[PDB]
Design a protein around this ligand. Structure first.
Ligand SMILES: [Cl-]
Ligand SMILES: [Cl-]
Ligand SMILES: [Cl-]
Length: 322
């Protein structure tokens, strides 16, 4: 029988991608979800091999102990939502070590930029690095994956930072603080995270214990992203660098503070998205090497812009794609 994988925030893009491919090949999944309501939660309730455990993570160790019971593998990706990401991250790691049966613990981590230059720590990223350091100290056989920017963030709706805005004449414009020519790491979370994580588990601790892996299959500067959308949609697409991220809709304070940090780190300092020496300087050799080695079936930005974006846009009530 395939191994049992414990997962949290099951409805999130990363966890859901892994659950789908894992259950399909025979793995049993023990997954935590904050609510059983919702299209993804219901989708997951429909999969036999998946067992859902509804409840919060924040200070809910008993659910954690239950989650890991009989689990052989784990893929943990936390969020800043509950307000105690480090606490939850340490609790999950402690619970996994306590289970005694976890052979491989994959934690989705991020950089703490303040460690690499005269830059601010990015609010929703730095805490994850603190959790990674704790996981490393536990001695739990582990691997740390660093997700690139989700291709899925793009929308013509007035959401911050990644608005591919539709102009009156049918052209699109994307305004953000990123330097137009510095390449950024991108990731088609839905399509590529699951396959990549499965391969990391197949390779095992022998191959990745204590390693960091950048989960990005393509790096593109903002102008290269626009060129991909342009070729995909046969419309002009233009990138415009702006110092501040305009907020046109109500957003959580947490995201608000995240955006302010992005303006400083990328707008002002033009710092790397993955500033760790192994990803920046030694680059990885390209930063996409390991991800591509793990999964060669990845989807590029141009294909996403041509095949997926129009479908998600229609589903969001837009009709420019007729
Ligand atoms: Cl969830
Ligand atoms: Cl034009
Ligand atoms: Cl609003």
């Amino acid at each position: 029988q395939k191994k049992t994988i414990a997962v949290v925030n099951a409805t999130g893009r990363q966890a859901a991608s892994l659950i789908r491919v894992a259950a399909a090949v025979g793995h049993h999944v023990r997954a935590q979800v904050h609510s059983l309501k919702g299209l993804i939660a219901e989708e997951l309730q429909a999969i036999p091999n998946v067992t859902l455990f509804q409840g919060p993570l924040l200070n809910n160790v008993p659910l954690m102990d239950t989650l890991f019971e009989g689990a052989h593998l784990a893929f943990i990706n936390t969020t800043s939502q509950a307000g105690d990401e480090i606490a939850i991250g340490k609790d999950l790691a402690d619970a996994a070590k306590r289970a005694g049966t976890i052979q491989h613990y994959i934690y989705s981590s991020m950089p703490d930029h303040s460690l690499y230059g005269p830059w601010p720590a990015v609010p929703m990223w730095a805490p994850k690095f603190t959790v990674e350091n704790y996981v490393r100290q536990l001695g739990l056989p582990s691997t740390f994956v660093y997700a690139g920017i989700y291709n899925n963030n793009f929308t013509s709706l007035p959401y911050p930072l990644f608005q591919m805005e539709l102009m009156p004449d049918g052209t699109f414009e994307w305004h953000a603080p990123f330097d137009p020519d510095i390449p950024l790491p991108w990731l088609d979370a839905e399509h590529d995270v699951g396959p990549a994580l499965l391969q990391i588990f197949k390779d095992g601790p022998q191959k990745w214990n204590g390693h960091r892996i950048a989960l990005t299959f393509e790096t593109l500067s903002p102008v290269q992203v626009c060129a991909a959308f342009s070729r995909a949609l046969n419309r002009r697409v233009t990138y415009v660098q702006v110092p501040k991220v305009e907020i046109k809709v109500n957003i959580p304070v947490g995201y608000r503070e995240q955006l302010e940090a992005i303006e400083v780190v990328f707008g002002e300092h033009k710092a790397p998205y993955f500033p760790l020496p192994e990803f920046s300087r030694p680059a990885a050799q390209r930063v996409t090497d390991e991800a591509r080695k793990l999964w060669s079936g990845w989807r590029d930005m141009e294909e996403y812009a041509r095949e997926v974006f129009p479908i998600e846009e229609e589903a969001n009530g837009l009709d420019w794609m007729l």
